[PDB]
């Protein structure tokens, strides 16, 4: 399995209502493992898996210590760009980045990532090569420059191929059995009628680990992509997902159509069927 | 100003059998900006003790959120979520449905 | 771990 260390902070100005928010998260795999909330009574950095509670009064503190900074680095950033696009005193608007790394099943650097937007549009990128920046526009192009100058990307190196890949693994090792874990899907089949000459057929996954899976149903052999019905992967709420793909068949056809999942955790995918 | 109208899906965490304990979930998602409003309902009522994880958002930088609640599901209870952002003309409602 | 970082646009 090849695994990921990301970490999204947003931050929201509230014009006339105090201080922006900044709400920091990070996760490995599909696992979050941590938050920061700006309105919280806290004001430090918390668990969000078990696996991290154990960590240290020095990691917390030091953890806390950074993301207050990434809290006034991100409402400096806010004003900034308030002033690159010379908008109104009066609007929120939001700035979200997103930081992390990824590493293959070997556990070595294979990815780095920095992208930051503002309006929920892409601002600036780091691109793969985490020297060069991706600049959306002139502003963001001002950015780009003063970036180039600090040697910012440079910087950005040693965190996401030491510091980044160096703790992922340690959160693997630590949190062993939540992430090092593959939980294969629970598949089975609905069956409700819509009317006298069609039904829906009902292809479920549920309990499974990590996110990612591919649920096709098809008639005859002939993928049924313009007319399957699916859902987002959501989450259960206990560190597994669900998803669905629905089908209406004319009814006597349900011989024909077979579901088929793939998952990281099904040693070969599965085709099911209504019969 | 990019403004993006969430997905809303309300499901169990695990199976209804009624009369067993379970979670009531409603992911919103897709959304932008952050601003969201979403309540779970109980033949209409308003659940109060619900909570929700922290707030994250996609490749496509539109957020996602899910709220949640224990619930023992019944077979006369009708349960919902009401949602509500500056994309709805009105707070949308959806119905849980068992068997999605 | 985060990084420490206080680089603005």
Known sequence: ?275 | MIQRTPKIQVYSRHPAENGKSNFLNCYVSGFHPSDIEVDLLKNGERIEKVEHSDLSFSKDWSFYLLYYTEFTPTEKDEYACRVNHVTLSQPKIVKWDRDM | TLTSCNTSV
């Open chain 1, 1 to 275: 399995g090849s695994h990921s260390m990301r970490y999204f902070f947003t931050s929201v100005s509230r014009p006339g209502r105090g201080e922006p928010r900044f709400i920091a998260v990070g996760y490995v795999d599909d696992t979050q493992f941590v938050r920061f909330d700006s309105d919280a009574a806290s004001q430090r950095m918390e668990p969000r898996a078990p696996w991290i509670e154990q960590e240290g009064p020095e990691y917390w503190d030091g953890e806390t210590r950074k993301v207050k900074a990434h809290s006034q680095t991100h409402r400096v950033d806010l004003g900034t760009l308030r002033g690159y696009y010379n908008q109104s005193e009066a609007g929120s608007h939001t700035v979200q980045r997103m930081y992390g790394c990824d590493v293959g099943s070997d556990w070595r650097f294979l990815r780095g990532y920095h992208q930051y937007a503002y309006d929920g549009k892409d601002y600036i990128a780091l691109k793969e090569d985490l020297r060069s920046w991706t600049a959306a526009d002139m502003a963001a192009q001002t950015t780009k420059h003063k970036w180039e100058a600090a040697h910012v990307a440079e910087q950005l190196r040693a965190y996401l191929e030491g510091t980044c890949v160096e703790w992922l693994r340690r959160y693997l090792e630590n949190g062993k059995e939540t992430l090092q874990r593959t939980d294969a899907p629970k598949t089975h089949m609905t069956h409700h009628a819509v009317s006298d000459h069609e039904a829906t057929l009902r292809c479920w996954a549920l309990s499974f680990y990590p996110a990612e899976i591919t649920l096709t149903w098809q008639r005859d052999g002939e993928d049924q992509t313009q007319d399957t019905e699916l859902v987002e992967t959501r989450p259960a709420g206990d560190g597994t997902f669900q998803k669905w793909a629905a089908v209406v068949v004319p009814s006597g056809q349900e011989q024909r159509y077979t579901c088929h999942v793939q998952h990281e955790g099904l040693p070969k995918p599965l085709t099911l069927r209504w019969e």
